[PDB]
Amino acid sequence: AVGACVLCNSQTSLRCGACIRRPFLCCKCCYDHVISTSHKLVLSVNPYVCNAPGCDVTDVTQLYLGGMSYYCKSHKPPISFPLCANGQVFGLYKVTDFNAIATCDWTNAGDYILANTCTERLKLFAAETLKATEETFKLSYGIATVREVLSDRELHLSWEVGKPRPPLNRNYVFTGYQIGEYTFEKDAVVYRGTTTYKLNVGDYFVLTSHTVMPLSAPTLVPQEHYVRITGLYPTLNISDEFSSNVANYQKVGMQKYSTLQGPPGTGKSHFAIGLALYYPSARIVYTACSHAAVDALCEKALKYLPIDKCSRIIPARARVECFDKFKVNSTLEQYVFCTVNALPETTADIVVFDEISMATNYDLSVVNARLRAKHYVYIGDPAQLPAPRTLLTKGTLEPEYFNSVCRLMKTIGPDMFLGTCRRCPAEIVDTVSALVYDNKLKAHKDKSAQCFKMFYKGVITHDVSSAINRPQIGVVREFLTRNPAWRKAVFISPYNSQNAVASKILGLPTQTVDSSQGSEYDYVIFTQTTETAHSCNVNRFNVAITRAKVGILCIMSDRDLYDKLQFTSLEI
Numbered sequence: 001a002v003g004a005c006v007l008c009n010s011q012t013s014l015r016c017g018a019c020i021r022r023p024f025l026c027c028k029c030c031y032d033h034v035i036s037t038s039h040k041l042v043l044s045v046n047p048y049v050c051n052a053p054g055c056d057v058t059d060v061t062q063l064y065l066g067g068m069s070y071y072c073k074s075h076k077p078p079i080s081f082p083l084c085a086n087g088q089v090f091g092l093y094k095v096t097d098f099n100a101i102a103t104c105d106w107t108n109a110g111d112y113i114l115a116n117t118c119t120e121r122l123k124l125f126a127a128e129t130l131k132a133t134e135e136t137f138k139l140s141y142g143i144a145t146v147r148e149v150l151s152d153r154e155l156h157l158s159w160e161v162g163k164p165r166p167p168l169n170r171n172y173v174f175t176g177y178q179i180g181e182y183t184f185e186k187d188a189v190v191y192r193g194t195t196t197y198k199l200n201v202g203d204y205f206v207l208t209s210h211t212v213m214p215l216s217a218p219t220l221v222p223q224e225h226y227v228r229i230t231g232l233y234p235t236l237n238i239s240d241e242f243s244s245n246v247a248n249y250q251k252v253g254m255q256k257y258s259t260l261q262g263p264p265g266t267g268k269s270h271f272a273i274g275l276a277l278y279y280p281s282a283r284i285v286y287t288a289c290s291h292a293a294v295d296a297l298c299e300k301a302l303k304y305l306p307i308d309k310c311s312r313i314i315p316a317r318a319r320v321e322c323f324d325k326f327k328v329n330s331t332l333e334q335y336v337f338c339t340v341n342a343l344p345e346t347t348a349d350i351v352v353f354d355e356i357s358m359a360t361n362y363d364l365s366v367v368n369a370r371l372r373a374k375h376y377v378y379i380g381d382p383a384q385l386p387a388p389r390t391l392l393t394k395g396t397l398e399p400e401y402f403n404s405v406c407r408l409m410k411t412i413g414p415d416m417f418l419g420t421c422r423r424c425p426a427e428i429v430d431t432v433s434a435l436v437y438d439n440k441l442k443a444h445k446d447k448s449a450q451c452f453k454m455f456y457k458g459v460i461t462h463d464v465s466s467a468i469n470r471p472q473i474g475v476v477r478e479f480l481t482r483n484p485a486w487r488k489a490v491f492i493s494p495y496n497s498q499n500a501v502a503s504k505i506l507g508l509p510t511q512t513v514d515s516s517q518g519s520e521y522d523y524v525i526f527t528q529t530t531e532t533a534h535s536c537n538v539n540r541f542n543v544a545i546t547r548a549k550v551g552i553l554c555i556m557s558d559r560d561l562y563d564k565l566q567f568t569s570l571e572i
């Protein structure tokens with residue numbers, strides 16, 4: 001019941017009983033909370049409640065100290081002090097932003113903006129509060145019960161009346177009943193069991209609601225600039241492959257933490273692995289939020305770093321298949337490749353945290369909590385996609401509010417910028433350089449003359465809220481008959497449902513823009529599907545078109561984004 005003040009750091013016995021996290025508030029700060037909000041329950045060693053039998057007064061503002069006990073106006077003795085007086089709430093050892101964080105429902109962009117412009121203590125309060133609110137909202141959704149099992153990949157579902165149904169995409173992971181984790185896709189519905197189980201009729205599925213542990217470590221440890229490379233030992237012999245990164249590698253060693261903005265195909269992976277060859281004795285932990293991002297780092301390491309000095313950390317509650325070619329779960333290997341949520345408590349010379357636009361302030365804290373490191377390197381691109389904010393429905397989250405790293409990259413700039421895209425035909429590089437990179441991204445490849453745009457609004461149907469554009473898929477089908485080179489194309493759209501329809505009609509493999517991020521394909525077909533904030537989002541548009549190595553077809557709904565594609569237009 002005794003701790004330090006979320007705002008002041010001041011010792012107190014006061015916690016807010018109304019805040020979902022129950023934060024330590026100092027006497028000056030507890031007042032400014034309770035006097036400005038619906039938050040009136042204060043706690044010290046016991047509740048600030050009226051001690052008179054039967055009395056229901058809990059509001060600290062209506063309470064007095066009578067000796068050692070607390071009483072309302074109705075029950076206080078003649079010799080009593082009000083608990084709230086002279087800007088303070090009585091307790092042992094005797095803010096606008098804290099109040100908005102404590103009380104908001106996290107449905108508004110402005111809530112995320114504040115969780116990222118605030119002081120560092122308040123970022124942790126925000127990130128733990130938000131995460132708590134995110135988890136207790138899962139409980140709101142209906143249970144799914146198996147009506148009839150059709151096949152090994154399809155069934156019919158019965159949905160609890162009175163509660164809403166959760167979106168049926170890969171984003172929403174269910175637990176079966178403990179028959180392992182399942183996903184569903186769109187009365188026939190497509191099921192995918194982590195454990196391949198003979199799905200029983202009357203079995204039920206629920207969204208995993210995991211307890212939110214407290215945060216302790218900052219999002220970013222305090223910045224430290226050094227005059228000399230600190231705690232690392234450079235090679236004199238560095239392979240010519242990594243020659244271009246040597247100055248950035250020296251920056252990494254002359255600061256506590258460094259940021260790298262690397263637009264698509266600028267060599268982020270190459271930078272991350274090349275850091276281990278430049279500091280060849282350094283113990284390096286490679287981390288990202290997703291298994292995919294960690295596995296991409298493993299693929300690069302396999303090529304360039306000694307396999308026997310590499311461990312892939314795999315949580316015993318194994319969900320998706322991942323990287324098999326390293327020793328699994330050897331924490332003390334020089335090179336450790338591990339998702340944020342599986343990190344062990346350990347030390348490192350260098351922590352490399354990849355795909356930083358996908359990280360939350362919660363993840364940033366967890367990393368600083370589990371890893372004691374001489375140097376922290378934050379790699380990604382704030383012009384790419386953030387973690388979905390499931391509670392956010394009003395306003396758009398700008399990249400400067402994605403997390404602490406992205407705020408730094410969008411305000412004071414990144415420490416390091418990889419400026420040459422080696423993946424994408426120049427048509428794409430030039431479009432996205434003007435769009436999100438203030439013309440600082442350069443094309444290494446020539447124009448491919450395999451980059452086409454068609455402005456075709458089509459007709460928008462919806463499976464629930466998920467968009468479908470059959471006519472845009474019809475145009476693609478027409479195009480594929482005349483463009484056989486594209487038979488190998490990956491079909492990409494901002495909507496799972498459009499992808500499910502494109503899958504049946506075209507037979508192309510299929511990706512949402514959000515699942516496409518980090519991957520590349522020779523040929524890409526993009527159907528915008530709809531003009532929504534989702535489909536017109538420049539970060540998502542950026543990721544969509546930078547997947548392509550050789551060609552892209554964009555069937556567009558949005559005049560602005562259509563006109564900005566530096567592509568050959570088609571017609572039909």
Ligand SMILES: CN(C1CCCCCC1)S(C)(=O)=O
Binds near residue numbers: 007023024126129
């Ligand atoms: C994250 N929590 C606080 C924030 C202040 C900085 C130190 C951690 C303790 S809380 C108030 O959410 O439990």
Ligand SMILES: [Zn+2]
Binds near residue numbers: 009028
């Ligand atoms: Zn305080």
Ligand SMILES: [Zn+2]
Binds near residue numbers: 016039
């Ligand atoms: Zn409160």
Ligand SMILES: [Zn+2]
Binds near residue numbers: 057071074
């Ligand atoms: Zn009373």
